[PDB]
Amino acid sequence: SVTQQVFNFAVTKSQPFGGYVYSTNLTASTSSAVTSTQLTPLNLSITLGQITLSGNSLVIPATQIWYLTDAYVSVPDYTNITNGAEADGVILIYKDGVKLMLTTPLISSMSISNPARTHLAQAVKYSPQSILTMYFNPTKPATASTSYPNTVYFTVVVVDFSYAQNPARAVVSANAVM
Amino acid sequence: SVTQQVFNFAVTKSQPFGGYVYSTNLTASTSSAVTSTQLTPLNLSITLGQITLSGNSLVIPATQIWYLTDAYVSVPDYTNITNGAEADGVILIYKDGVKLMLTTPLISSMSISNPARTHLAQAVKYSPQSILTMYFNPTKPATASTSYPNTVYFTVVVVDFSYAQNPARAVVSANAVM
Amino acid sequence: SVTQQVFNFAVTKSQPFGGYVYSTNLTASTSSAVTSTQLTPLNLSITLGQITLSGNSLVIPATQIWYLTDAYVSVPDYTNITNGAEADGVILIYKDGVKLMLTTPLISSMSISNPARTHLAQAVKYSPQSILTMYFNPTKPATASTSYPNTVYFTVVVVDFSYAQNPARAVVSANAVM
Amino acid sequence: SVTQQVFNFAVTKSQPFGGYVYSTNLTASTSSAVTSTQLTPLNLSITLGQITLSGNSLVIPATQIWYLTDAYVSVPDYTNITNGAEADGVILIYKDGVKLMLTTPLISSMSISNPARTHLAQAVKYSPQSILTMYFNPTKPATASTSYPNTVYFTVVVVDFSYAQNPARAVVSANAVM
Amino acid sequence: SVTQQVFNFAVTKSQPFGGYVYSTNLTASTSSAVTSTQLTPLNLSITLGQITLSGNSLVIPATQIWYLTDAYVSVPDYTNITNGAEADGVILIYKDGVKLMLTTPLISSMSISNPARTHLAQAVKYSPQSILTMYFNPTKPATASTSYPNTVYFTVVVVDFSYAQNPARAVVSANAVM
Amino acid sequence: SVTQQVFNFAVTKSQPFGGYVYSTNLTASTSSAVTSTQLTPLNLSITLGQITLSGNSLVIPATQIWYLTDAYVSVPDYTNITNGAEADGVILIYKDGVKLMLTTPLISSMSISNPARTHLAQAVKYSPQSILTMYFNPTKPATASTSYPNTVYFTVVVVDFSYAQNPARAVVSANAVM
Amino acid sequence: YSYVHNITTQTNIDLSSQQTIHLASINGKGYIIFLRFFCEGSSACFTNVKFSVKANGLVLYSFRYIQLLELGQAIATAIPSSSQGFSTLLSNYNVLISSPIGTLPQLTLYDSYDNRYGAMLQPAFPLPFVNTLSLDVDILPVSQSSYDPIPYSLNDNQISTNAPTGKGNISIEYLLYNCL
C-alpha cells in the first residue's frame, strides 16, 4: 500500500484549502516495435472532465497536483516479452526535462500476475504546470516476427482544486505545504 | 480487501441511529463489443424488494448510504481478454456526473484467477440522492472476430435507515458523521 | 483468518459465563436442476450430538449463537457450473423472513479451484431462536442436459450454552454483550 | 501467523518454570482408499528421537502440553482429490474421545498452494494426560480405479517439561498459568 | 521472511563487541533416492575462507555465531516431487546431537514456484562449537523408477568475530546478549 | 517494499543537507561462458549524465552514497540455466576489497518468472569512495554446446549531493547520521 | 461560482407505451446558460418523446420535436395551398438544419436518413434556478397523423393507437453556472 499512503496524504492536506482527490491511470506506450535503440513513449492520461492529454511530454494543468505512485505491465504483454515478441528495457522518468528522478527496474520484471513483483521506487510529486516526459532505453530488443509495441501503465493520484473558493491562492498555498 | 474495514466502519457509526448494514451485488456491462472509443456500461443493482435498478445513472434512495468497495472479473471473461476476444481497459467512477472519483486498475488484472488480484484503493461514499455513473476507457481493444461484451461485477455496502423510528430525520444526521 | 478472528472473539467473551465453542460445516443444496426462476435451498447442519437439523428454514436452537463466517464451492461443482450443467447466480441470506443480511457474490466465483477466491463481507451473527432461511436467485441457468443440483458449503461457528447451569435467558443475555 | 502467536505465548509463559518449546508435524492417514462411510485415520506424530508415536488415539504423556495449531494438505493430495482418486470430506477432532471441538472445512479446500487457503479455526490445547483422536467423514468418495489413501498434515507445538526439575510440580504450575 | 529481522538484530548487537554479519548458503542433500524411512542428509557449507565444511554434523568454528533462517527448493526438484520421482517429507534440525528445535514445513510446500511459499517459524541460533545436524523424515517416499536425491538449500547468517581485539574473549560475552 | 523503505530513509536524512535521491540499475556480467571455476564479473552502472562506469571493481564517486537493495535474473537467463546453457552459482559482494558484505542465494533461484522468488538479506550501504567488487563462484557449470555469458541485474539507490551548496564535505556530514 | 458542463445519457430506451425516465438532477443555486437535447435511433424519436426541464419542482420547459416543428419554432418554410400541409413536408425532405435560437427552443436538427434529431436553447439572459434542476423524458406514443399540436394544458398526456415504435437513445447536454 504505497498508493494508499499517498491517497491518505492528499485528502488530509488539500482538504482545509478546499480540494478534490482522485486516482487515474496513465498509459505510456512506445510505438511501432522497438528493435534497435532508445525510443520515446506517448503518454496518454484521462483526467476528470472527459479530457485526453495525449502526445509526448504531458503538461500538467495549472490547478492539479499529480503523484506518480505505481507501475505495472499487463499479463498479455509479459507473455510477449518472454517469448521475444516485444522488447525489454528500462523506462526513465524526467521532470521539466532536467531531473532524472527514477528508472524502472526492467519492465519485464513488473508483471501484475506475480505477487513478488518489484514496484516503483518512490511516489513522485509533480507540481502544477510542469513537463512530464518519459524515455524507453531498451535492452534485449524485439526479435520474433509479427512484433508488437510496448505498453506500461502507471497509477496517478490526482489532487484537483477547480472547485475551491478562490482557486488562484488556493493552489499556491496548498502546493507549498503539500 | 477494503470491504471488511468499511463494513465495521458502518456497523459502528450507524448503530446509535439504527443502522442496518448489508451487502449487495452491482453489475456493469458495456453492450456490444467495444473496439474503438470510450463506452458507457449499463449499471444494474439489486436491492431488497426485488427492485432491479437498471440502465445508466443510478440514484441512491433517500434512506440509504451506499459504499462502492471492490470488484472482480470471472474466469470465462479473463480467458477472452488475453485471447483478444474482448477489450481491456479501465472503468471510471463518477459522482454527480462531473466529479471523477476513482479508476479501476486494468480489469484483466482483476481476474479471479490472478494470484495477486488487485483491489480498489479506497471505497467511495455515496450519500442520499446522488447520481452514480460509469464509463469504460478501452486500452488494447478487441481485435479478434466473434467478440463479446464486457462484464465487471462490483460490491456495494448499503447502510439502510428505513427501520429506525424515522426514515428521513435520522439518515441526514448520520450522513454528517460517517 | 476471518474465521479465527470471530472464533477467538467468542471464546474470550462467552468464557466467563461458560460456553462450548466449536466449528460446524453447513450445507445449502438447491434441489433438482434449477432452470428458470428463484429457488429455495435445503439447509443441512450437523451439530454435536449427531442430530442433523435439515429441511428449509432452519430454526436455531434456543441455547446457541451462530456465526455464519465463510462460504466456498467444491471443485466438481465448478466444472459443472462453467460447462452449463448447473446454474450460476447469487444466494440471499435472511433472518426471521424479513431482514436481509448478505448476498453472496456469484457462487461460481467463490470456487476453491481459483487462487483468488472471493470472500463474504462480514461474519453474520444469529441470535438464540430465530429463523434462518436462504434463497437462490439464478442468473444464466443450467443449459446442458443431464443437469445437477447446486451445493454451496458454508462454515458456522456455534457458541453453545446448553451445558451450563442457566436457562435460555442467560444465552440471550450473553448474546447482546457480543 | 497463527502458529507464531501460540509459539511466543508458550515460550514466554513456560520459561520461568523451565520448559522446552518446539514444533513438530503430525500425519493423519486414512488408510486403504475410503469409499463408503466414516473411517478412522492413523495418527503418527514425530517427537524428538524418531519415536513416531503411531496408531489411533495418541495419549499426551504426563509432562507435555500439545498445541494443535494448523492443518493443510499436500499438492499431489489436492490433485488426487480433485480427480476423484481419493475421497473428500471433513475431519472431526475429539478430546478424550467424547468432546468434539473442531471440524476441518472440507480438506480439498485447504491445499497449501493456494494463498486463499482456509485455515484451522483455532489452536486446540491438549493438557497432560489426555487422548487426541480424529475421524474422517467422507463426502463424494473415491470413484476412479487405483484409489489412494488420504494424508492430512498438522503442525503441533509441544511444550516439554521432563528436563527441568521434578517435572510434576512444573507441569501443574505451568498448566495453571498458560 | 524472517531472514531480514535477525540480520538487523545481529548487526545492532554484535557491534559493541565488534563483528562481521553476513550471509552464506547451506546445502542439505539426502543421498540416493530415499524410498523407505529416516535418512541423514549430507550438509555442505562454504564460508568466506573458501573452506568447505562437508559431511554430516557440521561444527560451528570457535569465533562464529550462526543463525539458520530460511529454506527453499528449486523448480526441477518440485517437478519431480509432484511426479513421485523424489520423496516429500520434513527435515528435522538438531543441536549438540541432543536437542531438537525445529521441523521444517513439508519441503515440497516451500518450493520457489508455489505462490504461497511457506517459510520457517523462527531462526535457530548456534553458539561456538556445536553440532548442527539434520535428519530427513520422509512421508510419501519416492515411488517412480529412476528416482533422484533430494536437495534443500538453506540460508545462514554468520556473525564472525575474528577482527576484534581478543576474538576468543569477545564471543563468550556476545553469546550471552545475542 | 524493501527498496522503498531505504529510499524513504534516504530522503529523510538528505533533506536537511540537500540531496538528489534516485534509483538506477547495476548490471554485473561474467564474460564468455564460465565452465570450470570462480570468475570475475564486469560491473556496469549508469549515473546521471549518460556516464557508463564500466570495468571490474567500480569506485564510488567522491560525493555519492550508494545502496545495493535488490537483485533479479531475467527470463531468458533462467531458461538458459535450466537448459544447462549457462552456469548456476552464487555471487559475492565485497566492500573495500577487504570486507565481505553478502552472498546472493543461488542466482537461478532469484529469477523473475517464479511467483515466489527468493530475496537478498540486507541492503548494503556504500560510503564515499569504496571499491565495490563482485565474484561469481559457480556450481553446476555450463555443459551444453553454444554457451552464453551470465547477466545478473541489481538495483542501486544513489544519493547524489552535487546540487547542494558544497558537495565535498556536506556529503561527509550526512554519512554519519545515516 | 463555477461552470458545470455535462452530458447525460440513456443508451437503450424502448419507445413503447407510457414510460417516465429521469435523466439528470443538479443540486444548488445557479443560472441556466445553455441547453441541447438529442435523440437517435428509429424515427420514433420524432413523435413519441417529450422532454421536460423543471426547477424547484416548477416546470420551465416541456416540449416534443413535432411540437417544435408544427408550432413554427424551426426552419422557416412556406407550403403551397395545393398540398396536404406538413404531411407533404416530412415526406419529401430528409435533412433540415436551423441555427438561430433565442430563449425558446428550436428544432435545429432533423435527420430522417441518418435518424438523428436535436434541439438547442440559449437564453438571452441567465435563467436562475434555486433549489434543484431536473431533466425528465416521457415516452408517450402518438402518431404523426393528428397529435393536435396547439396545447391546452401543461400535463396533456395524449397518445394514439397506431404510433410508430422502436428503440432509441437519448442525450442531454447542459451548461450551467452554479454557486459554491
From Swiss-Prot, chains A, B, C, D, E, F:
Subcellular location: Virion
One GO term describing the cellular component: icosahedral viral capsid
Keywords (A to Z) from UniProt: Capsid protein, Virion
Role summary: VP4 self-assembles to form, together with capsid protein VP10, an icosahedral caspid of 87 nm in diameter, with a T=43 symmetry and composed of 420 hexamers and 12 pentamers. VP4 proteins arrange into hexons, while VP10 proteins form the pentameric densities located at the 5-fold axes in the virion. The stoichiometry of VP4:VP10 is 42:1.
Official protein name in the record: Capsid protein VP4
Species whose genome carries this gene: Sulfolobus polyhedral virus 1
Swiss-Prot record, chain G:
Main location: virion
Assigned keywords, A-Z: Capsid protein, Disulfide bond, Virion
Subcellular location: Virion
GO cellular component term, pick one: icosahedral viral capsid
Disulphide bridges: 39-45
Function statement: VP10 self-assembles, together with capsid protein VP4, to form an icosahedral caspid of 87 nm in diameter, with a T=43 symmetry and composed of 420 hexamers and 12 pentamers. VP4 proteins arrange into hexons, while VP10 proteins form the pentameric densities located at the 5-fold axes in the virion. The stoichiometry of VP4:VP10 is 42:1.
Record's protein name: Capsid protein VP10
Organism: Sulfolobus polyhedral virus 1
